[PDB]
Write a protein that binds this ligand. Structure first.
Ligand SMILES: Nc1ncnc2c1c(I)cn2[C@@H]1O[C@H](CO)[C@@H](O)[C@H]1O
Length: 327
């Protein structure tokens, strides 16, 4: 007997009541800008299927970022473009400024607004309680928006949250793994950074939803206020679930698996062992206590829950007392 099905408890049918044109990225015909508008200045980073460059738009002398896409599936390129276009102008969503294609080699590139990202080591030493609440609220705006627009980000992690702290500016980036939510759809569980993967991914439950992003966000919150980055530090996917179970406890994990009629690898049970649910206070120390409050812990507790259906939505999170001073 297979697992019990699931659907999102919010925004369940947002793509259902939109025109096919909205979510059908496969049929999306692309209109290309002019690649000779941009000059590459330096390489900023590289991933598996793209390289990212600082660039200048020579028509107005503004800095931009150019992401050149390695010859992967055209459907994945079209998906990311459609999602970026759908979300453009949303709060704290990185702005896709242009799309260009080398007219001879056919290589496509995406052009983004430039964000002057503050150095992590600098942020690590400077962010106050208030700063964290503010930026968390701004991330929530972005997630509530994309979720309300029927999109899961699926790669929420600190490296995909750019912060230009001197302008108090935040952008959620890297929409390369993002996907449209359709109720009943079985999704690839190989998404998100290991450290920010939800329990549903680690137990290979494919019928997940927007609530995956809320787990990832909870991990980020924990990392920031406890000053341990990443908070759950597994050495592989099996070990990642062990790190989670050592904090949330094994009892609720097995209740989760039981509720959804999920089957675990035999080896999984043996390495999961038996672990008490810990109190969040266990992670508060002299060095991080200025970032931790009762409302911070209550909020965190409402994000990091095994059952994806029991986690705060982005909207409910923004209503939490943790954000009173910010709002
Ligand atoms: N829009 C932007 N503005 C400035 N820098 C950007 C971006 C984007 I999208 C990515 N980066 C930087 O490139 C590297 C890989 O993401 C990382 O170092 C990342 O900081």
């Amino acid at each position: 007997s297979g697992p019990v099905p699931s659907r999102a408890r919010v925004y369940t049918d947002v793509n259902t009541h939109r025109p096919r044109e909205y979510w059908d990225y496969e049929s999306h015909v692309v209109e290309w800008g002019n690649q000779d508008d941009y000059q590459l200045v330096r390489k900023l980073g590289r991933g598996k299927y793209s390289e990212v460059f600082e660039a200048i738009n020579i028509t107005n002398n503004e800095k931009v970022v150019v992401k050149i896409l390695k010859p992967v599936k055209k459907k994945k390129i079209k998906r990311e473009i459609k999602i970026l276009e759908n979300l453009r102008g949303g709060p704290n969503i990185i702005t896709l400024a242009d799309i260009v294609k080398d007219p001879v080699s056919r290589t496509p590139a995406l052009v983004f607004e430039h964000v002057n990202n503050t150095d992590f080591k600098q942020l690590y030493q400077t962010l106050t309680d208030y700063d964290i609440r503010f930026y968390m609220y701004e991330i929530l705006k972005a997630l509530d928006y994309c979720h309300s627009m029927g999109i899961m980000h699926r790669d929420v992690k600190p490296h995909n949250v750019m912060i230009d702290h001197e302008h108090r500016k935040l952008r959620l980036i890297d929409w390369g793994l993002a996907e449209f939510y359709h109720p009943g759809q079985e999704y690839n569980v190989r998404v998100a950074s290991r450290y920010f993967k939800g329990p549903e991914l680690l137990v290979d439950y494919q019928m997940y939803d927007y609530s995956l992003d809320m787990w990832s966000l909870g991990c980020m919150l924990a990392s920031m206020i406890f000053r341990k980055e990443p908070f759950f530090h597994g050495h592989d996917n099996y070990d990642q679930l062990v790190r989670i179970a050592k904090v949330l406890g094994t009892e609720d994990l097995y209740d989760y698996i039981d509720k959804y009629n999920i089957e675990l690898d035999p080896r999984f049970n043996d390495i999961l062992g038996r672990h008490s649910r810990k109190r969040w206070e266990r992670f508060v120390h002299s060095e991080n206590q200025h970032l931790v409050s009762p409302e911070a812990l209550d909020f965190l507790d409402k994000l990091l829950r095994y059952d994806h259906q029991s986690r705060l939505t982005a909207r409910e999170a923004m209503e939490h007392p943790y954000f009173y001073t910010v709002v």
